[PDB]
Design a protein around this ligand. Sequence first.
Ligand code: HEM
Length: 440
Amino acid sequence: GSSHHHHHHSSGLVPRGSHSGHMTAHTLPIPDDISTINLTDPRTYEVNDLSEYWRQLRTTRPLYWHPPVGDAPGFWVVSRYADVMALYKDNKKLTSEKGNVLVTLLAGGDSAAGKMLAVTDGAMHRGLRNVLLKSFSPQALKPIVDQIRVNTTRLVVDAARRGECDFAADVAEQIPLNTISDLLGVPAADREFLLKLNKSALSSEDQSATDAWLARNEILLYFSELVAERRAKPTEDVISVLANSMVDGKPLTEEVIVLNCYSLILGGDETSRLSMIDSVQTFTQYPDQWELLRDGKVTLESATEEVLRWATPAMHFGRRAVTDMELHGQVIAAGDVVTLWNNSANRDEEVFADPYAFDLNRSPNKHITFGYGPHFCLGAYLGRAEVHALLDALRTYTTGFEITGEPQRIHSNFLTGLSRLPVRIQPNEAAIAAYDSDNG
Ligand code: HEM
């Protein structure tokens, strides 16, 4: 006996980690019936490959009436890119002011409506976007972007030296939220205070109902204290700009300014994470594309847009109809909730030649992973920068990587992607040495 092996028979597989997975990926059934799929529950995005579902809708039922599920009601499903683009543009005949996602739209409202940017229309929206325009311009964001790049490169290099890591928790969770609170102007000491306070605010399972409300309350109260320091000292950060500006003739109320600050920490976080996690997974699925990125045969800018188009973390956003509309001969009445499906739109063969090919040098690439029109993502440039920085770090300091355990999906009828991605990273060893002589 020189080298030893395990002894098994028809069983004997021990759990390695907290999961009990055996496969890198799973073949999901491709459904054919339209009525067999319920879009309300998250599970139907994890058990199904909706590729054929979405094209059946995109060719025969562009404006499809989804049936009522459990408690009322049914809703309109919009699949085609041109249709989705057109409805995003209309903030007059449609509104976000009664919610912009399935949960809020089907429940019949958003509690922050008329105050929070995403759920506000008319003059109030126009004014809120204008005061924040300069704060989100490339020029003002350049120091932020530069810091994102430093952080991402450090997190990737450490993950590369480590070799064995869970990409979600060790890299992806560690960029977006710290970026946005930096932009908001919270001190570094107060960051961990915000993180643990938000985690329970967004907890579900299982007097825990109000525990989440109090957690949210405390964040809002803390921001209100940072707001108070508007008069004390303006600081160029978003909190300061919002507290010291006025729209249109009147100053913004404590609740509004503070509620939008919180909307920034909600929106600046998960959706970027999901994109970053998705890119890494997709590179292991399409090695030639990864090779193309690593060997510098495609620009980071172009590659970034393809990763965004591929991931499409926010599967849908929705509106409610104020006045009656007529699309494709069919009637959309007042009160009806419409859902615009970005993930189907970024797979439309009408706009994207060979839609299910992951192509880093794809052009044109006019996706709608961010919105379109008035509600077009405020932090699109940030989302881009965070992906851009990851891609740049990856091609500089790694030669390749591989999925190491069964990845874990997030459960949402609205967002998609992974919460856990075990990877083995193969580091560019000589590149790290160059990073170590300069830094440290
Ligand atoms: C790649 C990641 C991201 C994706 C896929 C994404 C996607 C979107 C989409 C599709 C919308 C339109 C929603 C609607 O029309 O109702 C939107 C809006 C918005 N997003 Fe993002 N976003 C991302 C990153 C960010 C970041 C980093 C921030 C920074 C806080 C952010 C903050 C916002 C805000 C404040 C709005 C509301 C815009 C308005 O009401 O005018 N998002 N996002």
